[PDB]
Design a protein around this ligand. Structure first.
Ligand SMILES: [NH3+]CCCCCCCCNc1c2c([nH+]c3ccccc13)CCCC2
Ligand SMILES: [NH3+]CCCCCCCCNc1c2c([nH+]c3ccccc13)CCCC2
Ligand SMILES: *[C@@H]1O[C@H](CO)[C@@H](O)[C@H](O)[C@H]1NC(C)=O
Ligand SMILES: *[C@@H]1O[C@H](CO)[C@@H](O)[C@H](O)[C@H]1NC(C)=O
Ligand SMILES: *[C@@H]1O[C@H](CO)[C@@H](O)[C@H](O)[C@H]1NC(C)=O
Ligand SMILES: *[C@@H]1O[C@H](CO)[C@@H](O)[C@H](O)[C@H]1NC(C)=O
Lengths: 528, 528
């Protein structure tokens, strides 16, 4: 049978699923690591023991323990990101969509979910791999990894909670893909890892990390890069946050063994309930437990690695959305709300910039404010709102990605850059949020192909263009079929827009603002 | 006779002069102070001893000892500013143009020449007061004052060279106007002092200085304000430069008495020959001997005086030209030259910004560079040139003037602001210099009224508009005759353009750049 596959870990049994009036197979919930429960919580992942018999892979696995969004109860805009499965610490599984008939050796795509390293699931409807697997004839894999304290509590020096285990979870799933995708018709020498937000940052972290490089061929990063200001912390800050977490749960804080033992005795929801209480500043776009620059997974600082070319050299395709910051201001900056146009006053503008560049002094805040204020119309509420929005996006996503792409291209073997600015005809979010963080995903996964979802015909056309660029790129190292998406070069720095209009090529994506965030502000903060 | 006037200092005899096919009287070369020669060099001015007999006032007086421009020998563009009279330390005279028939009690205008406090003359053809006196029926006075070391050598604490004597020269001439203009038909209660560049800075200094305020009614400032970065120095820097001047002339430097005695024994050209050797930095738009914040003429710092409203409250009319900085880059920045378009490279751009903000550290230079570079076209030579030009103008003239006008309007009784951007049809300077520092003067003095000078008919029309605005303002406190030049207010901050086109009203003249130069850069330099 086409739904039975024998892997190096045991036999697994899939299920047939319908897609655009046809069908393909799906192997949902395959385990790739032993459940990280009990004394295993916080430890690096251990490889799944093989099993005799047949693993039932017909339904989605549980989602990892995580904080759940409740701002807009029942609002699809936000519920679509919450776990749609029971949560459990037993959550290290992967899902595989396989074209029918089963391929022999075709292109493989592995999706790594985003969610600021504190949330996320591989089972969300927007991550359904069936449309992409089917339309492009690729074997689509989506892995999972521990988030929050479970995946990133870091007490450097300890082997019980070394930090970065969530990344190691991902690596293990990738080790599994490399070792077994052939039995599902996948070509292990042609796997592309792609992810969005923390997923994009993760992809870049596997490009950097020596122990991950050999496990994949190419990479795609959506709205995220490894050097993002919110994606990593030092071992010290990591230690400081683990201790503070312990202090919140009334733990014994005399030794790492004492802290970890206490944290391991707490129920999942107990750690989640106080997780946010450990951030060092009042901030927007900052998360508690994230990857650490430990000297192991990351041999040295990210910047020196990027500067010395100490990373995997291959092709990469990546990009950003127009209004990456809107959602973060909606959730945490005063003056913004889901049901108004959110015109912001000067005072709220200013308190918003403070919230956005948490690590800046006064001189630094003035610099940012000056850089984003139209001084001959300072009380224009639409302008204050939009200016604040660009600040969040530029600082947290765009400029960090631009710095990564410029450093990468100096040593890489091919770069393709995009700027996704199509505002979906069926968006349920207020118009002021524009092209939101996370909303290019639905096009990458092909939702506009299903009529019931209500997209326009041009939007469906856009999704097919994107799906085919991503798949053609994963398969060849070039999104183009032999209108050309130009290669981004250190000299020309070209990129394309990605919407329903005829492709336009541009150059130096947000240079003006990014020279400010990548060169001036750091130098200014380092001297004061 | 109409050419004879009896003053409190003695009788004086004028000469009749032709103007636009008519005639008026002129009293040229009237002394208002004893010659500041010998042991008097560097001392405050002493009032002229009255004379019996008749003073021959039919010819222009000598010009004060000063550095003479020789960049473009015989080039009118630059020669028009050099002294057109023999130079001499005996130079404290004033010139009066009187309408014919002699008025009874009409509006008085006193012109104070510019020239960076190191040069200038009251006898230049562009300062000929006959056209203005005649056309507007005002008694036009032009004074003179010691420049260079002669007028501003400052060894604070000493009474032999206290500093600011050049300003005191001006005050004395104003004291004279106040005491004697009535005999020439002038209304001593209706005198307006107006000046350009250092002259404009001087006008503002008389508004600030308690001992000068009662001597005039209103004020006009052209391309200059008292708080300009090049218009004053501290007593320390002043002292430091006097000593360095002495060290250049091989003087004995053991005491003020020793230094001054030596400096007084040197010939005028000896001090002029080494005058530039004392600037503390490699700079553009900086001059050796300028006014000092001494605690006497200026009771406290200029900024605190402006902040506390410690100044003369009256009406003021003032403004700037579009390309104030061009001439300074022509004369001292690498890459600029009189006969090319001066497209500048990035390197020359950068060395130009260093030269322009002499007192800045590295962080400061980066800030300026970032603020003035179009980062998606950084190698555009026209852009680098123009960006550099605005930097000089914004920092040295425009933003300092905007800061002065905003502080002044908070306490004043009426402000009128202009932006002069007409590029004269007969300009002999290369087109890249635009509307040059000093080129609104010819319109204020009416040169476009004389056909031989070759202006267009619209330019002549512009000059009459300007002459009448200035005169109507001096006479009433309002340039408008009862298209309206709006009053500049703290709230609206309106100003007008001044060219051959229909008046357009605008708001917040260069706010964007000026918030940078008046608030950000200072704060940034003060923290690093
Ligand atoms: N106490 C502060 C905690 C509140 C934070 C909870 C918000 C949940 C975040 N959920 C979202 C994600 C993404 N886009 C959006 C866009 C809009 C709203 C929510 C999200 C793209 C990447 C996956 C996650
Ligand atoms: N070693 C450096 C010294 C060279 C400096 C000498 C240049 C003489 C300045 N002469 C000028 C003045 C003004 N505008 C211009 C415009 C263009 C050129 C020269 C001048 C308006 C204010 C009066 C003086
Ligand atoms: C696989 O497990 C699911 C989980 O409930 C169950 O519904 C389904 O019938 C099972 N299929 C087989 C063949 O065991
Ligand atoms: C990628 O590598 C190949 C072989 O090493 C080289 O010939 C080609 O020019 C490279 N392409 C890019 C975009 O660097
Ligand atoms: C005034 O002095 C000038 C200076 O040379 C002379 O030419 C002129 O004739 C004199 N006029 C009288 C009346 O003394
Ligand atoms: C100037 O002063 C007069 C009288 O003190 C006052 O009535 C008038 O409003 C003032 N004008 C301005 C522009 O301040």
């Amino acid at each position: 049978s086409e739904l039975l596959v024998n892997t190096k870990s045991g036999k697994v049994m899939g299920t047939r699923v319908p897609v655009l009036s046809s069908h393909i197979s799906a192997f949902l919930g395959i385990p790739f690591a032993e459940p990280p429960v009990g004394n295993m919580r916080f430890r690096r992942p251990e490889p799944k023991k093989p099993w005799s018999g047949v693993w039932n892979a017909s339904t989605y696995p549980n989602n990892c323990q995580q904080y759940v969004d409740e701002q807009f109860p029942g609002f699809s805009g936000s519920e679509m990101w919450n776990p749609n499965r029971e949560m459990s610490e037993d959550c290290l599984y992967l899902n595989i969509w396989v074209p029918s008939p089963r391929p022999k050796s075709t292109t493989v795509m592995v999706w790594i979910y985003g969610g600021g390293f504190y949330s996320g699931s591989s089972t969300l409807d927007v991550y359904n791999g069936k449309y992409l697997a089917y339309t492009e004839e690729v074997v689509l894999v989506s892995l999972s990894y521990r988030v929050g304290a479970f995946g990133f509590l870091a007490l450097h020096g300890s082997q019980e909670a070394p930090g970065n285990v969530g990344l190691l979870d991902q690596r293990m799933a990738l080790q599994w893909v490399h070792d077994n995708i052939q039995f599902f018709g996948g070509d292990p020498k042609t796997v592309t890892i792609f992810g969005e937000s923390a997923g994009g940052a993760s992809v870049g972290m596997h490009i950097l990390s020596p122990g991950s490089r050999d496990l994949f061929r190419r990479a795609i990063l959506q709205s995220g890069s490894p050097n993002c200001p919110w994606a990593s912390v030092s071992v010290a800050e990591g230690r400081r946050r683990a201790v503070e977490l312990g202090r919140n749960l009334n733990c014994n804080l005399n030794s790492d063994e004492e802290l970890i033992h206490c944290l391991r005795e707490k129920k999942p929801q107990e750690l989640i309930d106080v997780e946010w209480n450990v951030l060092p500043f009042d901030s927007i776009f900052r998360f508690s437990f994230v990857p650490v620059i430990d000297g192991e997974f990351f041999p040295t600082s990210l910047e020196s690695m990027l500067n010395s070319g100490n990373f995997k050299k291959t092709q990469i395709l990546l990009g950003v959305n127009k209004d990456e910051g809107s959602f973060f201001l909606l959730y945490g900056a005063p003056g913004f709300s889901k049901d108004s146009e959110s015109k912001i006053s000067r005072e709220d503008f200013m308190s918003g910039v403070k919230l956005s560049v948490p690590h800046a002094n006064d001189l630094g805040l003035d610099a940012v404010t000056l850089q984003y204020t139209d001084w001959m119309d300072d009380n224009n509420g639409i302008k204050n709102r939009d200016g604040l929005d660009d600040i969040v996006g530029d600082h947290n996503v765009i400029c960090p990605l631009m710095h990564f792409v410029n450093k990468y291209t100096k040593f890489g073997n091919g770069t393709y850059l995009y700027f996704f600015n199509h505002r979906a005809s069926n968006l349920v979010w207020p118009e002021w949020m524009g092209v939101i963080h996370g909303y290019e995903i639905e096009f990458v996964f092909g939702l506009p192909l299903v009529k019931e979802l209500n997209y326009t015909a041009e939007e469906e056309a856009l999704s097919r263009r994107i799906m085919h660029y991503w798949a053609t790129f994963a398969k060849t190292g070039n999104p183009n079929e032999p209108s050309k998406w130009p290669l981004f070069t250190t000299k020309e720095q070209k990129f394309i827009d990605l919407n329903t209009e005829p492709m336009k090529v541009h150059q130096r994506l947000r240079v003006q603002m990014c020279v400010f965030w990548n060169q001036f502000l750091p130098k200014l903060l380092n001297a004061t």
